[model samples]
Target: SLLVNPEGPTLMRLNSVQSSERPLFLVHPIEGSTTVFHSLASRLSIPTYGLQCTRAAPLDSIHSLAAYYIDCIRQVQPEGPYRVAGYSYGACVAFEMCSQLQAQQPTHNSLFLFDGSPTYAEAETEAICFFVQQFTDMEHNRVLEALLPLKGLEERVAAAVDLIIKSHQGLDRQELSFAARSFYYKLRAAEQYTPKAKYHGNVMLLRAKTGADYNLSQVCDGKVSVHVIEGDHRTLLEGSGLESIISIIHSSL
Candidate 1:
């Protein structure tokens, strides 16, 4: 079992478990490290592993970033008919990885997407439209300044990053120039690359009714099963909802 750490940049942490059952791979969202799945991992009966994002790496496309995850899988579990779950941006990468993995090895299992979609072009259009409506209502600098109310500067930064991850859909001049060029590239790549095969395994999509209108119904198309989890994106990883997420994972297995 390989468990990535929560704080480390390259890979968060890795823990090995002695088990005969196949492994579960959990992928985190953008700016979300391996720590996002800590609650779910602890509750799992079988072995669990997490893949963290390279926040600093300038990958040109989502496929390239997802390929990095595939490389991590190869490094950890070389011969695996493994199961995978991804949240938000991580889910996008997970779909690409599943495509690549199935092409390379014919025996992999299903993928679970927690509030994610398959077609980025459609998803991006929806996301952009929503942001356009919400942009005027947003208080960007005020929200950033509110982070100072947190206990420490680190907490403040984390809070700020979380805000950016959850709310912002459109790229600003600064983000486009410096911070988010790679994301734009990845979004474009995702728009261009369509999956060759419908992921034929069990896909459990735990969506939040209160979160942004992702219009998940468009992506469902009866190919993957959808389940509405109680709470928004953040609550899914914290509080009582975390327990619910764990139960869903166990039931899926």
Candidate 2:
């Protein structure tokens, strides 16, 4: 059984509008929630889908995760000219997915690599600085208090994500939180992954100018079609930044 959604479909519909017939799959970042994509997905009004990672056992390889996601995608969409967008860590997953999809047929794959590095690259922001920039004085203490008891990195990240969700009144949103084990294994799977070959397709990279501190430029290998948008990494996925992002996606299609 799947550890996330056990239903017949991993392809979730977030928009209220009629189908645009153009299906683009949006993959979430490290947050691992589809809640973040609803606002943006609804605005596009296309026949949109969001792929949320389901927790299964950690297999210590990226192939397992890629096969799982590819299976989910094929179940919803049997074939081609597939539009796939991914943010942050999702970019790495999308990159690998593109590798497999492109391998099947050169003419049927479109990959959108957002502001995230390849799994092999160092993180744009170190964990220490990421929390320092993200936390408020009071919230910092709150997060610390919640994390003080976690015994390992996996447990700490899991508990930390839990605190962020619950504190934001996310308990009622089932899609807002996933199993910590899924988070742990996804991170593990990505770290252990090395792409068999670099992507040769024309890819798109939308970068946030506000996240200048982030060293994601390496993600663009001159082969990527690039766009520079205004906003930090988090905001790039929402509000005004979301406008630019959606526009980029629309233009690509």
Candidate 3:
């Protein structure tokens, strides 16, 4: 059984507008939730699909994650030229997907990365804190109170699940636990991942001013275009940040 969305489809079509334009694929972030894509996906003129992790076991490396997502994408669109984008850590996965696709066919493909750069793994506590803020309605302090003092990872996670379910009445403990577990493994993968190959395809790096600029110019091998926009990393999908993203996507398409 899958750890996240076991009874649901992993590759979901987010928009209803039907057009002949090649569908744009959006990769999920660390928590493996495609919720962040819904706003931008729904507004897009073209059909958009969101890729998510559904396996019980996390893929250890970003290379493997990209391979798995490519298989998921192929189930819908069997060939390139492909349009793909990712937010935060998902950007790394998107980069690999485009790289692998180009190696397979050497065709023109578009890749977009929103405020993401390759980096070392973050501490487990940071991952835990991020998980709480992303998934539950409980106060960050309240969740941390139960989680931070616990020594074992599973113990902290269990406490978090209980606290989350207590605050959100209709939520299920099992699924919540699965999400927390998924978040931890995904965070680890992102931290350990290093983009080895250069992406020859067109890559537009829409960087938020408040986010770190990793100087991806060298990594993309002169194939990347950088745009600095307003707002912080988390708000890149909200308000002004979201408008900038929508505009970029429409014009790029």
Candidate 4:
């Protein structure tokens, strides 16, 4: 069993220990929920844990965020031969963690990237669009346009939150605001992050059919094997999409 922290645990045990295989530590996406990996974790043979961002406060940079998760995961495993995985924005942080761990020791560790890119060419706009759509799940043109005139980051977020409240009834304002704030900061962290050192080992990229082939050659020294999964970014984590992922991961291992 995994150790529980009284103040709220950042590392979550997602699956039972089925085998003696080394544990896999998965990083969380922008929303900071570890629940997303529960389904995948349940199917894997090895014990799986999720490195989640604590509710204490969001970290400002990817390096810091990666360092924070590394610290949390180390509490459990505390060594090399680490198998780390990440989905979407989480992949960037996972890569950073691998980079740091690799620096600490030249030991071989495996990195699994699930349809995420390291670059942030259009991340800010992507963050806003994703935030609005995730909240209302409807056309968010008016809400997005409303934010264009707002110069301040807080102002834009507040305007977006107000629009979401007006359109979607029964949703809590504070929750939405907090969610938006976290999402915004996560994206900004990804945007500002740059891979300073290239990872020594090979990286497994499970690319979604609809997602682009992320240019990871610049950051990875070994071959990057790209396998196209059946669904888009979000759907790739479920149903048939997940089946393909499981098969790929098993074979890769």
Q: lDDT per prediction?
A: 0.58, 0.61, 0.76, 0.77
Model 2 clashing residue pairs (backbone) = none
TM-score of 4: 0.82
Give the CA lDDT, 0 to 100, for residue 165 in model 3. 66
Report the lDDT tens digits of candidate 3 across residue range 57-135: 3468888888888888888888888898988888888888888887776568888888885543225656666677666
Residue pairs with colliding backbones in model 1 are 3-13, 3-14, 3-15, 4-12, 4-13, 4-14, 5-12, 5-13, 62-186
Compared with the true structure, model 2 gives a TM-score of: 0.71
- Give the alpha carbon lDDT tens digit for every residue of 54-84 in model 4: 5553469998888888888888888778899
Residue 42 local lDDT, model 2: 77
Q: Model 1, stretches more than 4 Å misplaced?
A: 1-16, 55-58, 119-193, 211-223
Please provide TM-scores, in order, for all candidate models, with all chains considered together.
0.63, 0.71, 0.82, 0.82
Error of 2 at 242 (Å): 1.5
Clashing pairs in 3: none
TM-score of 3: 0.82
List where candidate 3 sits over 4 angstroms from the true fold. Answer: 1-6, 119-126, 129-155, 210-213
Q: Across residues 1-253, which tens digit of lDDT does each residue of candidate 2 receive?
A: 1124523244577665576465888776765556677778878957778777644422356676556677777876787778888788777777777777766764557777667646431121123223322422335555555555555555555554455454455232333234443544566677777777656676777777773413334433335666777788767778888888888787767
lDDT winner between 2 and 4, please give it.
4
